[PDB]
Amino acid sequence: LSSGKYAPNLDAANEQEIYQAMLTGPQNMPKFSDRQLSADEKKDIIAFIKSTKETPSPGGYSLGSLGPVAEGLFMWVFGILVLVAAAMWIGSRS
Amino acid sequence: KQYTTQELNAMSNEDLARLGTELDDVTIAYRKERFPIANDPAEKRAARAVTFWLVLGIIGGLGFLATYIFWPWEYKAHGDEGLLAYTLYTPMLGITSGLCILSLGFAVVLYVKKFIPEEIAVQRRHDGPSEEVDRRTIVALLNDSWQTSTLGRRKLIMGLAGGGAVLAGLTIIAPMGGMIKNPWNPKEGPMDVQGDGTLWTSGWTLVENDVKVYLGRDTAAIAESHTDATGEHWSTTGVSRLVRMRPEDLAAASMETVFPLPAEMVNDGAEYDPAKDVYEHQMHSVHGPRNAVMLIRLRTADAEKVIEREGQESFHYGDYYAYSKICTHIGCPTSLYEAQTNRILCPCHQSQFDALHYGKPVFGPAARALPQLPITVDEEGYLIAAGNFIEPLGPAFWERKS
Amino acid sequence: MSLATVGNNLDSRYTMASGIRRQINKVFPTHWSFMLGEIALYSFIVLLLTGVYLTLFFDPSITKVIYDGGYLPLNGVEMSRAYATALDISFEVRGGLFIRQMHHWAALLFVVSMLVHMLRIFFTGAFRRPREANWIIGVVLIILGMAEGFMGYSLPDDLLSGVGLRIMSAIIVGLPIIGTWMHWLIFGGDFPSDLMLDRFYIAHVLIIPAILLGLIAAHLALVWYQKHTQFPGAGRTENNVIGIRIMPLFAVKAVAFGLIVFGFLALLAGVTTINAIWNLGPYNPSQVSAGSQPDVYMLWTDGAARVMPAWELYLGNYTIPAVFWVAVMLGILVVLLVTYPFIERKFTGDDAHHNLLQRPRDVPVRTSLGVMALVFYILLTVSGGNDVYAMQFHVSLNAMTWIGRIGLIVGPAIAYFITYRLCIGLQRSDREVLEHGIETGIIKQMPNGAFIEVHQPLGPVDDHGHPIPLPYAGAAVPKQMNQLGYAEVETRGGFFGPDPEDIRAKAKEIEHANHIEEANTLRALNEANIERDK
Amino acid sequence: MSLATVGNNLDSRYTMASGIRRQINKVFPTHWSFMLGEIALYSFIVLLLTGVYLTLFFDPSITKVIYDGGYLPLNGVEMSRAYATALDISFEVRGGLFIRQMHHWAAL
Amino acid sequence: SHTIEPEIYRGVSTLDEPSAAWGWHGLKRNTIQLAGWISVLFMLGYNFGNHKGHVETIWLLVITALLVIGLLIHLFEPKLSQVRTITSRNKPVGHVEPDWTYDQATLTGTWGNLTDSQLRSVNIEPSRVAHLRAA
């Protein structure tokens, strides 16, 4: 978020802490009363959060699930460097 | 010079090879064998290096085919039996296939790098301009063809031929006008809950058709899998995607995403019908391009210091304010309501809108304030849209005033 | 085997012996960085094959369905057929996720290999005459590959990709005077529309691949016809090529490097997740996520949109939105990339036929322009993912936006300065060796107590013992003694024991003879080249 | 006319003159039936152009939909998206029927 | 000592930058000026945007001040003269040092006129050098 604020990683919280995060509106987090998001809705939100935090990816290492940036930073640095190494192993120098 | 069959027969095979390369202006400057000693230990030492990776090429290939056929590949959710076996199917596929193919490649690279001889070969280039006779003669032939034709004399046939050529080109490409579409011709039929399909409108324009349009919250409901003797059927007949919401619902410093919910597509409250199929239309409303509205409740301390815009006074209802959730930069959702600073932040290019200064952008590449919806409450106390926006919603375009 | 009959029939029917003799005798220079184009070729082939596999399972429609597939955490959810069949590729087809991820990793490898290949071409000067055509078509190739990846990852119709399409649509409407009509032409209407995914699908699988392949074909044909450039070195002239022949060496090496590329992509495709559309859900215009960002080869555009100020013109009944200047910026830097050879020929005045290359130290203006452009593009790329950076390194977001803005002036300039001075310094180091000889590292003390370092000259000497300074020749000068071979091992055997001394003595004699004759042939070819210049 | 410059560039960069001279002098016999292969070739060209055009308006999905479009004698009828977008080519696109007709005739 | 004569290519002399024959050296003073000035204009433009803070403004403005005084000294070069003082018993410019160590080793020059007692005080018996020292 702006000016040094940020939505933290949800991994550290437990289920009661997630519920009370929603209920209390900690710092710049919008509050979510049980009139807005019902009890069953908050149970479902906690279920999604914990099932995504607990399941492994079927496709290999997640790279921290950061999407195109991290996947890029892996191919555009490491991935090109090992094939540069192979091109030097197969070719000549000056 | 040429060679008779007897002379080519008189040669040795290496001499024929030398002649072969020199016919292409290539010369082998240097060339030497890798293992000249007769029964070198280093040659057997190199053979075992190559066979190592060929053995693992075979091992990896067979392991890939075993993994691919017999490893349990089918989906498992968290808590299921054999979850770990499923999470490793694709990993094992790749590590075995990589073993196979990389080991074959390494075998071949090593074979080149220590069995095939080493050589320096030198080829002469033939580039630059051509040999001048060919330049003069090709120019002669082409000039001859043009002057032969006699078409340069006939200015009328040339002009008409060019005109017909370009006009035939137009005739070929003119059916591309089947793609051209007036952006200002409305969509077919009457107006919809997504608007008339122009850049002016939205679902909230339906207020102008005398329709009562509630502000409706997304229940996020899913279809239900009924099952009976005739099969299993996912259905949506008693399920509401959008439901009306009331002014008591949001605490101060809460934000709710609300969509236009005409009174004809409502199915909730005491007037609920368990067979009233409205999920399809409410879904059509949730997917309107510029239908999403950000409904915020300020704290009283915040509403004591909220700055109003000309003509948009009395759009709010008490401490409840309503803005367009579509960013005024290039159209992302402006979802991030910093509850304490009262600044609505767009996660695309980091524009910041001041919810206490009629949504005016205070940072980023946005230049216009978020549009504001007029809202109120009706005779049953549900929040409703008291009017339409007074601005075009979404990003800017050439035909927009201010 | 009776290959004589096959060869005789083919030759009697086509008269092919001379034409094929010409191709097995063709020579290629064998520097390592002449393999960076190859990677782009091989990853492209992978992209083709894996792509056709995906088309046997994919439906590109924006029609909606209720999901009833494998992935249970989305069953009962309304989604397009595109998202549904991408989930079926990912979960209900055996090995489908493997081929999906291999396709995406191949895309990333294709684009970055094109980048580093182009940087070789730039820093070595292989673009200049007679080879500007390959430069223009290669710039076209990198642009079309970028567009291809964009349209490709827009297909599965997840939330992130659809936000990307939203941003494309918003930028196309903003164009004066014709943005609205262009949008209604491209998308067939307002966004989303019926035919948008069909048009992006046929653009992705047929149109852009066809242009890409045709231009790769023309590109490789021109590279084969205009024989390859080479660095300066012993025997090497503008008028020759020194290296290895197609048959047997270079063809085998190409096949093997291709196998390595294929296996590396296969491995990536198994051991690391990429995209993971099932966490993102289906596209919804009213939803968004903090880690937005396009794919890596598009982050520069994103960053250009983040660093731009909100400069808008009101004229007054018409509007110029603030992102128009971002389009102007992209147009400028595309035009300047594609027309650079002519810029360099304008401002250098060089227009000779060049077949030898330049070491980047010896052309410091170009190397400094290159590194400054590298830094401008790096700061645009980090400006794109600047919020992920901020979250992950405890930097203020707004600080990162202003870092991007100011950096896009001060970073390139500092980069130019530092690069230029380092280039001149490397030149001076080489000139030190050619003036006074290799610094062996040995320090002796003379009788008068003077510590003198022992130098090894690379040429003649005067009677004082001081080398006669050799002229620079555009080639690499050895800097340490071990490059001349004075560290080379002189035992021979396995790790666990030596060969018999007869074989070792014989082998070392043979190896010494090899080195002497290789040096002799390059020296004779060097003298012959002087004589050809009279 | 400026052609001196143009050719000078091309040949100087590609050593072009001898090859194209070998090509422009190639002889062809002119019996009428030796035109027939050209007919197939030109048909194929037309087929590719019109085909790419038709891909800009066609949705190959089998998913069923109630039709609402230009052809009113099938309004309210349930059909796959493939048939529906074929009908929309035929009646909603200006010149679409002409192009689909040309594509099919060129196939024959 | 010997070295090859100087030469100039496109105005870049080989002493100031080697390899001037081998590629694009240079980039002229006026174009560095133009780059700096027009990028300074683009720096000043940043101040006008919609932002409300002023940490941004002070950053922009000092960076402009530094770029500007840089461009100024790049246009108006402030050369200075070699100093010609003689401080702290330094010697004027034309002086020629002897090799004191050669003198100590050979007992000549600065070590020439030692007395009998002084030679004896550096562990040399003066009979060892009486024949070798000059008349």
Ligand code: HEM
């Ligand atoms: C004829 C060649 C190609 C075909 C048939 C093809 C086919 C496809 C299809 C059908 C998809 C749908 C999404 C999916 O199934 O995951 C896809 C995804 C994609 N394609 Fe292609 N493609 C081709 C070439 C390329 C090229 C050349 C590139 C890059 C320059 C590329 C980059 C991508 C990317 C990045 C994706 C997204 C991968 C993902 O969804 O995980 N494709 N491709």
Ligand code: HEM
């Ligand atoms: C998918 C895209 C591309 C492929 C498959 C490709 C392939 C190749 C290959 C295999 C070579 C010869 C080997 C080597 O020099 O590495 C080559 C050379 C060359 N490439 Fe590319 N390339 C691509 C893109 C580009 C780009 C982006 C540029 C520059 C803007 C470019 C310009 C050149 C030039 C000028 C040469 C000639 C090098 C020389 O003659 O010394 N190509 N390319």
Ligand code: HEM
């Ligand atoms: C789309 C498909 C085809 C195209 C575009 C095509 C095109 C051509 C052209 C232009 C010629 C030279 C001029 C002429 O003879 O008309 C030719 C010759 C030839 N065609 Fe085809 N043709 C096609 C199909 C076929 C078929 C179906 C056959 C036989 C089963 C065939 C066998 C031949 C042969 C043997 C020649 C050489 C004739 C000669 O040199 O006199 N082609 N083709």
Ligand code: HEM
């Ligand atoms: C790049 C090449 C091609 C493309 C992109 C293409 C595309 C299409 C498309 C989109 C349709 C949609 C159905 C319709 O319009 O009713 C179609 C129909 C058809 N295509 Fe193609 N096509 C190509 C090549 C060919 C070729 C080479 C042939 C024949 C050998 C062919 C024969 C047909 C026929 C007969 C139809 C049915 C047309 C109708 O019933 O109206 N197409 N094509």
Ligand SMILES: CC(C)=CCC/C(C)=C/C=C/C(C)=C/C=C/C(C)=C/C=C/C=C(C)/C=C/C=C(C)/C=C/C=C(\C)CCC=C(C)C
């Ligand atoms: C591959 C991919 C994926 C992508 C790619 C895309 C593209 C197309 C890209 C492109 C890029 C480019 C081309 C870039 C470029 C860039 C550039 C060239 C830039 C530049 C910049 C510049 C500047 C900023 C400059 C500055 C300057 C200055 C500031 C100066 C200063 C000076 C001074 C201070 C003076 C010194 C002296 C003394 C002090 C004595």
Ligand SMILES: C/C=C(C)/C=C\C=C\[C@H](OC)[C@@H](C)[C@@H](OC)[C@@H](C)CCc1oc2c(O)c(OC)cc(OC)c2c(=O)c1C
């Ligand atoms: C020759 C090309 C042809 C035939 C076809 C296709 C052309 C493609 C264009 O590039 C060439 C296209 C990528 C480009 O057009 C200006 C726009 C999408 C703008 C680039 C763009 O994307 C974003 C994006 O995708 C995102 O996703 C999640 C997120 C983004 O911010 C957070 C952006 C973004 O801020 C920008 C500027």
